[PDB]
Amino acid sequence: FGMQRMHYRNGDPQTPFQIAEQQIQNFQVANWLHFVNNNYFRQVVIDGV
Amino acid sequence: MDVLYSLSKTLKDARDKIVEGTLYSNVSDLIQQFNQMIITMNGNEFQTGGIGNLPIRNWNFNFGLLGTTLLNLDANYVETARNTIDYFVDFVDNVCMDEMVRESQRNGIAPQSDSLRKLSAIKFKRINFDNSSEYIENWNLQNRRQRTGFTFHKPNIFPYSASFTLNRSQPAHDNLMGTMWLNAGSEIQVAGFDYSCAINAPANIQQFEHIVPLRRVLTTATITLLPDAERFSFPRVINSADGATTWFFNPVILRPNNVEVEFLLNGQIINTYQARFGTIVARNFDTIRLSFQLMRPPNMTPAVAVLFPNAQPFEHHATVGLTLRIESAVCESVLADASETLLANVTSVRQEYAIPVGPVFPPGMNWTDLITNYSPSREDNLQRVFTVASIRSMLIK
Amino acid sequence: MDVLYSLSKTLKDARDKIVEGTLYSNVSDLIQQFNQMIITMNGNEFQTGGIGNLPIRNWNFNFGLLGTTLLNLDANYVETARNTIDYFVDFVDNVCMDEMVRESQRNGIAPQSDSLRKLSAIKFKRINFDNSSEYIENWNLQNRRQRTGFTFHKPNIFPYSASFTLNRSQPAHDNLMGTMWLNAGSEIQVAGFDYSCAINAPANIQQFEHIVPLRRVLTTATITLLPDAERFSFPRVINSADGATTWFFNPVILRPNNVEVEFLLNGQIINTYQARFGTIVARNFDTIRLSFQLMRPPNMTPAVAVLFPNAQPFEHHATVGLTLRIESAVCESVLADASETLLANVTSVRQEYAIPVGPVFPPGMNWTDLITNYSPSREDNLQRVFTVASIRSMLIK
Amino acid sequence: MDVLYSLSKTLKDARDKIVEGTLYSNVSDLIQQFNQMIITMNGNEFQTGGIGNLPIRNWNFNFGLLGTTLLNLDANYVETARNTIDYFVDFVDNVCMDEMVRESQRNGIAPQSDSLRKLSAIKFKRINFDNSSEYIENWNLQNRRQRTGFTFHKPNIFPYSASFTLNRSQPAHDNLMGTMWLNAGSEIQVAGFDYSCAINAPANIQQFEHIVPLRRVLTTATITLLPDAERFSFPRVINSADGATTWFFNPVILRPNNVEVEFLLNGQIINTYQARFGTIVARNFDTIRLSFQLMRPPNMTPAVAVLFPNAQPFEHHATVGLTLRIESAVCESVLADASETLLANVTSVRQEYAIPVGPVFPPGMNWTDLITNYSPSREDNLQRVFTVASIRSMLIK
Ligand SMILES: [Zn+2]
Numbered sequence A: 001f002g003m004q005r006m007h008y009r010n011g012d013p014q015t016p017f018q019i020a021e022q023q024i025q026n027f028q029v030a031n032w033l034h035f036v037n038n039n040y041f042r043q044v045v046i047d048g049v
Numbered sequence B, C, D: 001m002d003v004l005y006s007l008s009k010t011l012k013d014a015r016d017k018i019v020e021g022t023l024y025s026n027v028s029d030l031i032q033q034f035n036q037m038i039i040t041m042n043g044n045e046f047q048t049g050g051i052g053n054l055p056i057r058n059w060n061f062n063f064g065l066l067g068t069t070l071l072n073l074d075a076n077y078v079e080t081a082r083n084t085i086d087y088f089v090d091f092v093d094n095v096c097m098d099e100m101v102r103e104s105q106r107n108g109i110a111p112q113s114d115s116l117r118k119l120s121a122i123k124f125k126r127i128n129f130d131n132s133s134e135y136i137e138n139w140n141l142q143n144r145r146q147r148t149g150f151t152f153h154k155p156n157i158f159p160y161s162a163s164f165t166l167n168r169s170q171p172a173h174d175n176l177m178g179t180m181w182l183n184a185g186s187e188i189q190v191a192g193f194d195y196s197c198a199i200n201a202p203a204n205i206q207q208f209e210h211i212v213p214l215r216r217v218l219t220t221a222t223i224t225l226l227p228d229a230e231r232f233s234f235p236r237v238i239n240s241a242d243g244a245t246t247w248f249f250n251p252v253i254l255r256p257n258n259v260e261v262e263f264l265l266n267g268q269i270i271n272t273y274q275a276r277f278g279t280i281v282a283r284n285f286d287t288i289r290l291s292f293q294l295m296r297p298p299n300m301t302p303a304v305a306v307l308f309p310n311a312q313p314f315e316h317h318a319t320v321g322l323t324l325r326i327e328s329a330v331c332e333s334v335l336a337d338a339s340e341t342l343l344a345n346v347t348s349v350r351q352e353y354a355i356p357v358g359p360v361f362p363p364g365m366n367w368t369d370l371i372t373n374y375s376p377s378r379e380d381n382l383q384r385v386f387t388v389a390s391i392r393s394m395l396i397k
Helices: A016-023 A027-038 B002-017 B028-041 B075-100 B114-119 B122-126 B134-143 B302-307 B342-353 B367-372 B376-392 C002-017 C028-041 C075-100 C114-119 C122-126 C134-143 C302-307 C342-352 C367-372 C376-393 D002-017 D028-041 D075-100 D114-119 D134-143 D302-307 D342-352 D367-372 D376-393
Strands: B046-048 B057-059 B150-153 B158-168 B177-185 B187-194 B205-226 B236-239 B246-249 B251-253 B257-265 B268-274 B278-295 B317-331 C045-048 C057-060 C150-153 C158-168 C177-185 C187-194 C205-226 C236-239 C246-249 C251-253 C257-265 C268-274 C278-295 C317-331 D045-048 D057-060 D150-153 D158-168 D177-185 D187-194 D205-226 D236-239 D246-249 D251-253 D257-265 D268-274 D278-295 D317-331
Touching (some): B002 B028, B002 B134, B028 B075, B046 B075, B046 B114, B075 B114, B075 B376, B158 B205, B177 B205, B177 C205, B177 C278, B187 B205, B187 B278, B205 D177, B236 C251, B251 D236, C002 C376, C045 C075, C134 C376, C158 D278, C177 C205, C177 D205, C236 D251, C246 D302, C342 D278, C367 D278, D002 D028, D002 D075, D002 D114, D002 D134, D028 D075, D045 D075, D075 D114, D075 D376, D134 D150, D257 D317, D342 D376
Parallel strands (some): D251 D317
Antiparallel strands (some): B205 B278, C045 C057, C150 C317, C158 C177, C257 C268, D045 D057, D150 D317, D158 D177, D187 D317, D205 D278, D236 D246, D257 D268
């Protein structure tokens, strides 16, 4: 996208994908990055476990 | 009650912010709050109703958290959210109605419905969110025993009272001196009348006084004072004090002189306004003393002179009036006013569901009676029901 | 419409929050929304105006995004932000004016301006933000066919009407029985007069009825009911029904007897108040029926007896009255009230730009005519124009 | 001023959002703002008071940042926040009072109190947050030279003025023609009277005019115009122009004829309504011209004919009138109104602390005098004190 290199400071509270989804205008890339950022396991009690 | 308010607040935020197309950064924290609410409310069984005609309803919560994987919320996400939001709103509405239709002589400020009692538990404290509304803010301040304040436009602080007092009278009711008034809502309208026009009074001056004691202390009140009482300036026929007969009042209106308005607190004059009409300010008061005089005009043209003879048969009766209107004020307790809809909401719920007359409020939430005898128990119950009504009014149109 | 509201809301938040020296954490999400708006709007061209004297203006959008690098906003950042916000606010202003000055007899709820039609496209849906205002909230509910409600202070429901009805009359107009009424805004004043003072009426009582139907259903309304009508308590010369002559009205006011105020919804008695004055609550109603009687005083002092003879020459005419003010109410439709300025804004824009009379609203947005014939099409157009007016006033002071 | 408002807004948001149990994600940004406030204010000393009886108080700031990490706020976090919030609330209260009780003939807008002068320094700019309230919005807009706007309900634009003008008079006051008006708050009530009922007037018509200028331009005002003046429709005994004697006014009301209400801006008719009553709109105006006529009824029934003779003795005096109330309006300058409490707050603080009469405002903040001689310096000081009062009311009940 012709954007300046991300000067990512170590220990930043946000990850490079979390920054990039904000900085990127393209909807496909932004949507994929957002999925990667907010994708978690789901804790479910199945059959008592 | 803070928990119920937080439920209403988060549901309102979900309705007003979870819209198709909105970025997810605009609802990140709101979705976190909504999922917190769902987690806390899952697995709890509630019951509402049972009083009057309010139906018995049972509430179960087994919902799933809202998703967080969309950059922009789309139609499917909004529909999924609305499915659960409708149920939560219905639960909150029923809790609010069940709490509004109840009252208790002892501990009237404490929750009265089983649902609100259960919500008062510690486990539900996680759903607290932000308490920014005026009524919830005053609720929290009162619980902390801090300052409370409600701003009212035209506060309904005066119980309805339309009456007259006769200081001079006789069975014929043809030579009367006295004062007739109407106190209603936020307006006092008083008029002192004398049939002889102070022909035989000392210095040709007749004094009139009108004391209106408010049931609560008002502060920073903006008031309008006008030099006539339009309500007692036309001919009328009034029943006697005992109702035996009727008497004729035929006012001719003069200018009240030596007008004094005293706004008193604990019997100490806090504000005093002499011969000043229009917009005035009372910073802190609980009683209004209006003093005025009927002064026989020292000089009269023949048309004026013919009106006021020195003998008995007075055809025209000299009247001087004042009109006071509280446009805006601040009170520590709750009152009905012109702009708010809380009294209407509570009365409407009770009338719609035919709630039997309880032991605290007068039948049909009669505001005249309530503000006439605004006891501390009634004040606590009224604050509770008004807070619940405000909480319900952010979900139900 | 939601896109237009989102543009207005984001610009308002930008002007309030993007101020010099503020933390970037205070405006991170707002700036994300702002950049989303800029990206969605760039490359599009709009045209606003061309109706009446409203100028035709072309709007192009090519704006760089707002930065996301400062810890605290500084003067440069605010200057750039305001240079963009001013242009966006002007575009929103003109879009709202173009939408307000237009009306349609068919599909009046749909957008009418070219710019709002363009913004109705799906590509702009990403600019949706939150719908927190009362008017936009009700717009969305109405779109979803859900129950709506606007809270009005002194709703302007009753079209102006000052009239009288005569149930007994002669060409000389010397012995009349009838009613006089003024209905205006939120005020009803009705007087029943009888010249004979019910000397020969059965049981010496004269019955008076005043039925005021509303063009829209009101709910949870607080109402002040007072036992007299000051507007019909002084001498009058009134031109007759046909304007051929004039008759004299010299009233003497007696208390209204057996006062019954009924609030009916679809002809079913929802609320009834017998001889109760002051603050009352009508929870749901579409018509008001005021019933009152003039009872000849059974006992009279000599003055009243002289007032009321048994022969024709009735110099004084017995009169009873009722006043009914609607302090607050809730209506599913939009109305004009004494607090809001939306009717004023729409009327002002139309008058300023000399908009020709359309096929929907009456000339000059005459509220009396509009609320007299409040058609469903007129209601749709009125809600549309009022919603856009509120959106506009969100930004323009 | 902006910094003071930011302190108040931060404290109010802290009190409303930092509550036990709330998710920390709901208050993360607010906590960053709170820490920014503490860092900026640490190490600075302030002094307030020293005027009238307002006590002199000294303020120091040595509070630590909030930094505890949790998912949901606990009692410890709330208590630590509340200590600092209490101290800051006290400081803001005293600063606001100190600024409210002070004036300046020159540079009214500029800060007057030393605390606010210090806070206007650049090093405090790091606390701005969001300037959303109406008054701070208008403050910032005025600083940016953009058009301001304050929306008032029943604006208090008319200085109290009850008067009469006698266009035709005799020492006996038997045969009078003229006008009689009361302008107060938002209501004009005018009445033309003619004792001869225009018997000898050309075309049996008498014309009355009433011109009411305004001290400030109002825009988008909704007004109710009714055809009768209640106030001047009763028998009166009125002192003459020079006060030597008194005269009798015994009106009989006729319908006003050829009513024309004009709203003019700089002498140019901006709006005009002929023979139209009810709700009307004036989009922009600085004076009101009310023209009406008393027309002798060409046809009269015997009662009316007896009422109006052609000879000298005039027992009944023909009267016509108008009432005009501004229900809501928008003004570029601040004004008092019936729904706000800013004038009440400023006057209350000044009265409570016995602030000596300053060089700008009239004694006791008399609104009639203020709005009569509403000078530019008075407007500047009034806006400053009203903005401070709004900021204070954000925190104090
Ligand atoms: Zn009002």
